[PDB]
């Protein structure tokens, strides 16, 4: 597939510096949906402001975890059915921490933002479309974790 190749090529640029790129993704996310901030409760305390989250080692580790899951999705872009069961359980976990299924579309827009910013002129409409479809497949598998 040509879509598969657009994904693997663009991901190559981003995955050189995953924390730097993942920081962009979460900075964008909190700018779009500030009500996601209290869902990161480490030691039972809440971040007051989005900049607080950036000095938390646990929060930075969660950015690394995110980037690892995307990496696994890119690795298996040709056959995602093998990640399906892990992704369902990952959805169930996020339901438990208080994440609403609707928030995963803001996460989707934040990922596209971070790609657009990182790739500039190389972020073509074909590339955008490919990532959108892949993210779509990932969300579908995760959404099974929300009971339905
Ligand atoms: C709506 C945005 C999200 C919020 C508020 C959020 C919050 C959390 C919290 C509070 C935990 C448990 C504490 C921790 O491990 O840091 C967690 C676990 C995790 N999250 Fe996220 N998360 C979000 C989105 C994502 C996305 C999009 C991915 C991957 C694509 C992801 C991957 C993970 C992984 C891999 C774990 C560890 C799961 C386990 O094995 O227990 N999260 N999430
Ligand atoms: Xe952030
Ligand atoms: Xe931020
Ligand atoms: Xe971890
Ligand atoms: Xe990572
Ligand atoms: Xe990565
Ligand atoms: Xe993501
Ligand atoms: Xe993805």
Curated annotation (Swiss-Prot):
Tissue: Predominantly expressed in brain.
One Pfam family recorded for the sequence: Globin
UniProt cross-references to PROSITE patterns, sorted A to Z: GLOBIN
Residues that coordinate or bind heme b: 62, 94
Induction line: Up-regulated upon oxygen-glucose deprivation.
Stretches assigned to coiled coil: none
Family the UniProt entry places it in: Belongs to the globin family.
Protein name as catalogued: Neuroglobin
Species of origin: Mus musculus (Mouse)
Gene that this polypeptide is encoded by: Ngb
